[PDB]
From a paper:
Therefore, we initially attempted to determine the crystal structure of AnFPOX-15 for detailed rational design. The refined models comprised 431 residues for a protein molecule in an asymmetric unit, although the enzyme consisted of 438 residues. All amino acid residues (P3-R433), except for the N-terminal residues (M1 and A2), could be assigned to the 2Fo-Fc map; however, the electron-density map for residues S297-I303 and H309-P313 were relatively ambiguous. The structure of AnFPOX-15 resembled the known structures of other FPOX enzymes. Recently, the crystal structures of group I FPOX, namely Eupenicillium terrenum FPOX (EtFPOX)17 and Phaeosphaeria nodorum FPOX (PnFPOX), were reported. They both shared high amino acid sequence identity with AnFPOX-15 as well as showed quite low rmsd value compared with AnFPOX-15 (0.80 Å and 1.12 Å, respectively), suggesting their structural similarity. No significant structural difference was observed between the ligand-free AnFPOX-15 and AnFPOX-15/FSA (rmsd = 0.46 Å for 429 Cα atoms).
Author numbering: 3 to 433
The structure:
């Protein structure tokens, strides 16, 4: 029974972890029977969801994407917990190359082919007046030859504030927590030597926790903690910040997310006039030597870098150039603004960009909730519901099949992206 079942959530201070913790409580699980274990207190300061904002937008690259999007949209708009952090300003994809424009038109036609009537809230913009109509901060000279795709259900998400909102609820309900070395996963605990029955986890300080079921939602650290057999390759993307005065930020109030595949994107300034700018690239890996549990031999795994141990860290010099090019494209008036809060954000890719959400093949009672593939923060409100369904053996096949244990199903180093990720050991400047 739910009331008498104990669950351990590793990485419960992150996106998929806190979501799982939330839906356990909603399902009627006893709060004191739930134990969240994360290196950092929720919201985890090293979590990929520990950001000013993320983008919410429709994307149909896999079979479960449509239902996951519709589910999250419904909750981002109506759920009293998540609603205050969704800003529905829309999103616009632009391009001036013939291949980029070609790609816009195909993405638009892709939405139509779903047959649910997405053409009602998604429009192609073939004129310059149509573009300026939805994004008046551009100039007519700037957007000469641009074509646009406007998705109206889009917008951005107050990321860290949303995870923090879940955390406040968890603590207020009486969920037990473990931080620092007492919250840092080391290995699972087993009943016998055959290791076919998991009964808990041990942290790096030696502390042991016992429960009926364990959930591993360690994000980009998952493949370093347990042996995922190269199903997940962790990569880092980059962003920077610029600050506008209230008078400068005025022309961008309620502005749609602007995106161009050949440059990157930016989001409207927040409460403090801060604009974030990402670029567009396959990501950076960081292979460092590590022994994940389940592997008999120290493998070389892409491990996220610790900002705590490396304070001077920003990002490679190549990133500085591409971020400045993005700024020159979208916000040329601010080309003299200073960049600050340069940082790297870590995700983990699967081969087909589907999630990795499944019970461990051998470790019965041990479950995996990772494989975010750098596009899953949008699933914060609803992903935890399906993880619970997995634990109770009620996950529908459309999700269970795509999220299945699938080693040797392709190369996650390249994934669905344009190129294999380069490593930070070959990029100068970030250290
Ligand atoms: C990097 C990035 C990602 C991103 C994005 C922009 C950037 C720069 N923009 C997005 C967007 O616009 N829209 C969107 O939908 N997603 C976007 N993303 C991706 C998103 O951030 C990730 O997909 C997602 O956040 C990852 O989820 P996950 O739950 O997997 O990740 P996490 O929050 O990092 O969770 C990890 C937690 O695990 C804890 N941890 C790590 N190790 C341990 C150990 N050993 N023991 C206990 N806990 C551990 C971490 O501390 C963290 O709390």
């Amino acid at each position: 029974p739910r009331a008498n079942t104990k669950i351990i959530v590793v990485g419960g201070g992150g996106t998929m972890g806190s979501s799982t913790a939330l839906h356990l409580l909603r399902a009627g699980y006893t709060p004191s029977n739930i134990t969240v274990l994360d290196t950092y207190p929720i919201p985890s300061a090293q979590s990929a969801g520990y950001d000013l904002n993320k983008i919410f937008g429709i994307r149909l690259r896999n079979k479960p994407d449509l239902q996951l999007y519709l589910e999250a949209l419904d909750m981002w708009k109506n759920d009293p917990l998540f609603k205050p952090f969704f800003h529905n300003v829309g999103q616009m994809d632009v391009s001036s190359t013939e291949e980029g424009i070609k790609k816009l038109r195909m993405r638009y036609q892709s939405l139509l082919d779903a047959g649910i009537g997405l053409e009602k809230t998604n429009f192609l913009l073939e004129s310059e007046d149509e573009i300026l109509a939805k994004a008046p901060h551009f100039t007519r000279e700037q957007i000469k030859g641009w074509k646009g795709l406007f998705c109206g259900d889009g917008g951005w998400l107050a990321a860290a504030k949303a995870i923090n909102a879940i955390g406040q609820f968890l603590k207020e309900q009486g969920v037990k927590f473990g931080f620092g070395e007492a919250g840092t996963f080391k290995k699972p605990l087993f009943a016998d030597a055959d290791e076919k029955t998991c009964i808990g986890v041990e942290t790096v300080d030696g502390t042991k926790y016992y429960a009926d079921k364990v959930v591993l939602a360690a994000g980009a650290w998952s493949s370093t903690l347990v042996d995922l057999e190269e199903q997940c390759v962790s990569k880092a993307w980059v962003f920077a910040h610029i600050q506008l005065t209230p008078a400068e930020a005025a022309a961008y109030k309620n502005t749609p997310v602007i995106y161009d595949g050949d440059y990157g994107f930016f989001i409207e300034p927040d409460e403090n006039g801060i604009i974030k700018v990402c670029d567009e690239f396959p990501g950076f890996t960081h292979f460092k030597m590590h022994q994940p549990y389940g592997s008999p031999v120290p493998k070389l795994i892409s491990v996220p870098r610790s900002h705590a141990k490396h304070p001077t860290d920003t990002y490679p010099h190549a990133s500085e150039v591409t971020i400045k090019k993005a700024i020159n494209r979208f916000l040329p008036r601010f080309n003299d603004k200073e960049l600050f809060n340069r940082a790297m954000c870590w995700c983990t890719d699967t081969a087909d960009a589907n999630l990795l959400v499944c019970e461990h093949p051998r470790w019965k009672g041990f479950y995996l909730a990772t494989g975010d593939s750098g596009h899953s923060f949008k699933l914060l409100p609803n992903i935890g519901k399906h993880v619970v369904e997995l634990l109770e053996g009620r996950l529908e096949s459309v999700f269970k099949d795509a999220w299945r244990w699938r080693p040797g199903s392709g190369d996650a180093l390249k994934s669905r992206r344009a190129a294999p990720a380069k490593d930070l050991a070959d990029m100068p400047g970030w250290r």
